[model samples]
Target: SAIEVIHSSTADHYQSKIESVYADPPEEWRKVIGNEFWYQYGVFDEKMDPSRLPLDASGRRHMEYQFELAEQAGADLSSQSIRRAIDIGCGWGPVLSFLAERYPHCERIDGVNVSRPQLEYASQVISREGLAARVRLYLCNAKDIGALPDPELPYDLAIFRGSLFHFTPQVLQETMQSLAQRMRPGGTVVISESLYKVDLATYAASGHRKTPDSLHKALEDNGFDVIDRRITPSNEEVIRWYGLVKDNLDAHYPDSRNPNFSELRDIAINFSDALRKDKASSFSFIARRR
Candidate 1:
């Protein structure tokens, strides 16, 4: 079951995995991420129920800082004649909706995701909000932008919320080069990533180490100028939930890629330890297309 679940990728599969993982998770978690369970939680969900979201001890401080960065980027918005912006890794359109509410003149907001169920959810959310006219969602890979039938359509703003760390350094560099080709000169790209130099190694050992500094340097090398970077302990309890499973699973099932609760809870404990120690695991970045 764990092997099959690990191989699964869709929201349904994730949901199923969570259901199996947590025989009885807290009901609050269901309300937090808008999933009936925790396992369904993916990289992004801008439509989340604000009330149920978790917060680490330093969470509010992180948000305040992020807003300051957003304000600067928001000011950039006023200078551009932007009618459309592509959210390079839009999970479920929540942030795009937030942008739409602020920039009503934006006729189109393109949200791209790799998961079919997620794209479907994004479409449904946009339609339900009656903002379909202003938003477009697609199921595609950001790294393979050229393989896309449509090419070189420039946008004023691009977003990569929580996606930079999903690729290897080489692939991430290639992906950034591809995305830069899709931006208008002077356009801006905002990124929110978790910078886990240590965790990257740990995760890499597990088969998925996201983008790191080398990837960012690649972006700078390809013609993007960095504007801001911020780090905060994640208020995302799911991180703890997932971490708890990983740490212990490594010990009990030394060669096991799959994990259960005893391991998950231990992983969560490690998260608490990181917070207690003030180690950096959370981060976000903003840049301009020069």
Candidate 2:
């Protein structure tokens, strides 16, 4: 039980980067993410007017798409089967509240995060959504899921959105193994992450971005079979995400104390360029533990 998980120094670098992200005050994040509580892009099945969709509705659709992918892969993720669910990188707890509200039959929904600020906000959100009794949020690393104080185990589902890049490849392998031990047989894990087409950028937090082949091999080696997958181009989505709020962000934030949208937009633009050039892709997978 004493096995240490952080074997790579990159873990520290990645940890701090993620922590700094949640260190921003809630008011700031609300501006960037809106009421949707999503820090990721919406997955559109058909082209529609972005302005026509409420960010919150689109965000819920994004959550539904993951479960739908698992369903398409033949996982019985209905409320009866999903009695216990875990959100590995449960940001401000949007997904936590979503799971609890959608599957009221789900007895326990656990959310893990590394940032205290984020966890504090999540606690508020959980109570606000009247899910305090069923949802438990923790300030901890996702790889440390196995180490949480016991409520119950062998979760029926585990989900993470855009959080794997925070893990070094070694930590990811460890996490996959840990989940294998803790999930019920045939349980599902929905992974939506940024993938590198080539094995570059492993030294920084992005170092954990696995290529398509690399990710498949990791999942297969961990006793998982990718039954369904989706690859999304991030350029247009990022543009919509930013365009929806850039004007407001510009008008409101002139403080150096906060991360203005422009700085975030620059990072996003470069990242989208990576996505456009075939150097990277946004990959979603529904993998069942074999």
Candidate 3:
């Protein structure tokens, strides 16, 4: 595929662009789209179908549903005995903060990322909540967690939300293999993100898709036990998010000549069209270190 055959420099450029988007998104962008840990894909209703339920309209509901989905997929979040946890690429620290508030018994919650601005924002939010001590932020590559000083040994759980695609195939293997070594024997990995079902070559070419084989192979090769897996309808929420962005931009900056205005509209339109045509999909999973 053209994307896969491209030079590493080109790949790095795209990856850097993605990181920058989260590192310092526009203030107006954040205002229009709430700064939550997860993408605003609404939770699937009981019928295993996507619908814009009341909760689907806001970030709070998306987050709440994330936790619920994790639990339903066999995450041991209810355990008061679980001690340490890590969230890779934890944007703004919503999941860490949630863990701090919901499971006060946990001793430490570490949020690791390569983005300084995101780390700073997360630090401030965690501090304001008075959970600064419990939720620690680290600025480091996701694959180099072992290098961080004063490491929390044997994390009880680790989460990789929508940010998993940030890792290339090689780094994904390295990080998961390393994490397997650092996690408790029975500790869990919770992943909630988009996945591609295309062939490995197509996925590699795209530079972002996680094929079913790639995902399962990574976990199994690293000695993790798959406990649960579930797929849900998600395109509506993405379409809604872009729609909101367009509406907000139109209302507030009707005459502004920002390139983002047009770019945002195209993204919304393209994603909506692709999803409706079954060209995209997402899934959730829980795997335990064996």
Candidate 4:
């Protein structure tokens, strides 16, 4: 929890580095997402319309974890003090939309992300789902919560989906500290991300490091209590990605599926395999002020 952070000109480099994590995937997967044509083409699913991808088993399972937490909190969730919620590092608004759907009473849901492109895609999804008026998209960094403007009179719930680990301990500390100001006594913070594998001494402060103990320490140190913490790992999902790749090899070829689909699937396969091999692919934690 340092006072200052340097925005690396290499900030963009982090994006490239993340892609490198999926480097084992075919070149097409790399290009598909890196290039502008990526989401535009992939947004359409035969099962749905121009938008909305079925929450597949994996997606739904993840959403359910968050939904259950909100429900158990007994906050009346819909239209309660939780009238305002911020989806930290919300990408493409999947988690936000899912939460909005389950808790329709929430007056406002803000999707915060660094990529304008992803935010645009999220806005389209929000519009398509007819939840545009309730969902707000902000182009911002997760560590710069102080910069957010006119956030409701108070923010009750802040949901971080698979994005907290992408920050360094100092940044994470700073972020929690910033959020503490916006969090009222009864407010709660729900975070779902990869944790327990990070080492503060070795991990870069600006990079991803979402360990449970570390996160809990950071929260309590900043005046929060650990109300509940849960770990929902998805190693099985990782294995499925591997199987999909082996069986769908031809699917990635141009003569078969579109190059974009081929690329996306390839990356999916690689990503899933990585998750399977590593036990901590996904995790969720809920905390609140004392």
Candidate 5:
């Protein structure tokens, strides 16, 4: 699956292949990202909840940091004029609801995801939360976001939470260039992911390797001015997230009722090992359209 995504511009078939790879049990989705899963590592502030399979607190807590960066880039979320925001690789659309809650004036909040199953859940969640009208979810690739119906161009804010690793450098440059075209001159864009401290020959299903310096270069090359760069709470905070999963999955879900437990637990262990070795670390960058 990772190989399929890595080698070409198979954009048409790419979405289906990725979706098929993640065609897991609904429960597995919960275990991987959390019940309120926004699909990224957490900056955990609470005590361990062994009952909760994958404790992903990053989405909520990290949004604050994103907002701070956006503010520094001069795109405040609370501004009444900031009417549209887009989550570029919105996984399950939790961030869309969060955006609506904070920026009520934002009439159009869009989340684009490649997985139909994930979008189905996102649609249901939006309706359940009475956010269907203002918040919209689409099954689409990040690079083709402009093709969406009733396209909300000139977006005031855009976020790539947990999406950086999914695109190769060239594709990311393309996506960023298109994003700059769709966003207002001073609009804010934030990209977050676990970047390589040293490039590896191979990585997991995340699709590619990106270091911190590479991110800066990509953003600047794509018509963005880097405003702020951060480790997001701290390196120790996110590394501990994976480390906790590795240490506790067995004790919490030992019955093997969930087939994904064993596999994902191993993934956590590997990810933690990489982080611990200083080969990779989570980072967030905020930029303004130049």
Candidate 6:
């Protein structure tokens, strides 16, 4: 019952935040986060062992985990036969980039994002990686992804990494249904997201974090049947990201006036506190169309 409470301004707030951070990030931001490559929280220790890798390698591991989960979900990414795939809220196109490498025979792979600047940056990466022909980036909101004209009627695989929480329950249901319509029967969908201990009412402020049960229900309601789910405790990585942001600020912005720095620092702190109190976690979910 609580999960059904709809909230306003969630998507808009998320869009605004992403546009500001990624549209035109500072050189300092690039230096700390490793520009275009390392954006999301990297996987440090899978079981929360606290045995972390160096920052750059950790970020790369996070990207690799996506493919692993996809394979587990029964997506044949490397098949010789032509396949179609889509990455929702593709960020700078890391997953799309990987898809190009693994599925060269893929007839088409689309990366959708609402931010114009992100798409522009993704275009450069796609061209540089020699994927311009096979990979396409679209400036479309995740909720209305089905509206985009596509000759490739149904994609074989779809990925939503760290982007699902941007939608409210209603939007998530509608978006998942739209995505389901665009996916072939038995297509695989993999989702990786951060989970919150709080309920729907408190989640309105941060615009991230969804409960695992609600997420499962939404996926089932939209034609996806859950096959596998894994929850990883991630306080170490969250705090590490905060440290990265703080270290960069200390080095480059001695007396920083940058609002982005403040925001990142605050987010890191909030996540850290939540984890410290055992109030949050990170999760990976694999599903197939019914």
lDDT of 5 by residue, 1-290 (tens): 01001222435434554566456654556644567765667655554343445454555766666676667666645667578888877877778888888887787888877766667777778888888778877666776765555554578889898876777666577678778888888788877778887746554355566888988998898898888887774667766666655555656676655545666676677777877776778887888888
Each model's TM-score?
A: 0.64, 0.85, 0.80, 0.68, 0.83, 0.83
- Give the range of the ten consecutive residues with the poorest summed lDDT in model 1: 1-10
lDDT (10s digit) by residue, model 1, range 1-290: 00000121212222233223433233322332333222211222343334643332123223334545755755266624667687765654566666677678886677765555445655766777788777877655566554443454577777776555555555566667877787777777766665555544544111234444754687799888877765532445435534533443445445544344444445456654754465535566777788
RMSD for each model, in Å, please? 8.8, 4.6, 6.9, 7.9, 5.1, 6.6
Colliding pairs, model 2: 201-207, 202-207
Maximum-TM-score candidate: 2
Tens digit of lDDT per residue, candidate 3, span 103-171?
798888888876666777778788788887678787766677665445556788898876777678776
Candidate 6: RMSD over Cα atoms? 6.6
Better of 1 and 3 by TM-score: 3
What does the lDDT come to for candidate 2? 0.71
Candidate 5, which ten residues in sequence have the lowest lDDT sum?
Answer: 1-10
Identify the runs in model 3 with alpha carbons over 4 angstroms from their true place. Answer: 1-15, 35-40, 44-58, 200-206, 252-265
Could you give candidate 2's per-residue lDDT for residues 17-78 as a string of tens digits?
Answer: 77876677777777666764676667554533366444555566667877777787798787
Q: Candidate 4: what lDDT?
A: 0.58
TM-score head-to-head 1 vs 5, winner:
5
lDDT of 2 at 284: 79
Query: Which runs of model 6 end up more than 4 angstroms from their true locations?
Result: 1-18, 26-28, 45-53, 73-82, 198-205
- How big is the RMSD of model 2? 4.6
Q: Give the better candidate number (3 or 6) by lDDT.
A: 6
Alpha carbon lDDT of residue 243, candidate 1? 50
Candidate 5: segments with Cα more than 4 A from true spot: 1-14, 45-58, 72-74, 151-153, 199-204, 247-263
lDDT of each: 0.54, 0.71, 0.66, 0.58, 0.70, 0.70
- 163-206 in candidate 6: lDDT tens per residue? 78776666677679888888877788878887876675864134
